[PDB]
Design an enzyme around this catalytic site. Structure first.
Site: not given
Ligand SMILES: CC(C)Cc1cc(-c2c[nH]c3ncc(-c4ccccc4)cc23)ccc1C(=O)O
Length: 288
Positions: A19, A137
């Protein structure tokens, strides 16, 4: 640099890709951009034979993300995909303050700060389950704090979509310290998806107040054994309310059938401050 976007520094790494921070020169807005290399995904997949290909899984994640529009979930704005280019760019709205916590830490959250964030988490997960998505997650480093102080759920790399009332799953994905005992057990060949997210929410809340995981080992095979077989034990410090202790114990019930469900969690005395801070109804939160 890329279309209207100026690419800046790498700011995080999830399950897949990198990211990075990007600045859109047209609307003067900062965005978070997940960058994936197609060749990397294919090379790393290697000789793996699977029902779904690496690139195909990326498209499934994109499809999941396109469904989601909630204040406590990240927002996918755009996908930049050229069949001629190796890189694929997923552009998201930026959540300015970053992850709420990285485990382990010597400075955990107060009980009041934990309740504030846990309420956001409940609302975001109720929404995901309403939209037929299991995150898979859930952990503190995937919960991003906005400028307004509220949590947004991120990293849908291992998430899946289910058609029914619940998801029936047989595979083990996500972060090992947050995986439910059912998923790791050979005896349980299939397991409820919602209960996996609740277990991970439980580990997350324990992390919030203690700054450490309930189950941990350096060797991942031992960690799996401890998750299945080690009794939940709370640290001596900080000394938390029996109230909170009860909620965490029920979320980390190793039996998924007796484990507390989200509709029960919403009404738990700790979450609500004994009715002082009630959560909105499912319809108010999800389709309003
Ligand atoms: C672990 C995490 C990086 C996973 C992730 C995050 C984001 C994301 C969307 N909006 C964001 N705003 C801020 C930050 C951020 C800021 C400071 C520090 C770290 C992250 C991240 C995002 C999108 C995709 C993924 C993924 O891998 O699927």
């Amino acid at each position: 640099q890329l279309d209207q976007y100026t690419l800046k520094d790498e700011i995080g790494k999830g399950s897949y890709g990198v990211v990075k921070l990007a600045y859109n020169e047209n609307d003067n807005t900062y965005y978070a951009m997940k960058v994936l290399s197609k060749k990397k995904l294919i090379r790393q997949a290697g000789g793996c034979i699977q029902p779904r290909g690496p690139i195909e899984q990326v498209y499934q994640e994109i499809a999941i993300l396109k469904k989601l529009d909630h204040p406590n979930v990240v927002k996918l704005v755009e996908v930049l995909d050229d069949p001629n280019e190796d890189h694929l760019y997923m552009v998201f709205e930026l959540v300015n303050q970053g992850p709420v916590m990285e485990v382990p830490t010597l400075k955990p959250l107060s009980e009041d700060q934990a309740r504030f964030y846990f309420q956001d988490l409940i609302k975001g997960i109720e929404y995901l389950h309403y939209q037929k998505i299991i995150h898979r997650d859930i952990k503190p480093s995937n919960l991003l704090v906005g400028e307004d102080g509220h949590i947004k759920i991120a990293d849908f790399g291992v998430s899946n979509e289910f058609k029914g009332s619940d998801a029936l799953l047989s595979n083990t994905v996500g972060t090992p310290a947050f995986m439910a005992p059912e998923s790791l057990s050979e005896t349980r060949k299939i397991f409820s998806g919602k209960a996996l997210d609740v277990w991970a929410m439980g580990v997350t809340l324990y992390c919030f107040v203690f700054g450490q995981c309930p189950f941990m080992d350096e060797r991942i095979m031992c960690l799996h054994s401890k998750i299945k077989s080690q009794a939940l034990e709370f640290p001596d410090q900080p000394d938390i309310a029996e109230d909170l202790k009860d909620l965490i114990t029920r979320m980390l019930d190793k039996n998924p059938e007796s484990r507390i469900v989200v509709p029960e969690i919403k009404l738990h005395p700790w979450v609500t401050r004994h009715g002082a801070e009630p959560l909105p109804s499912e319809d108010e939160n999800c389709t309003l």
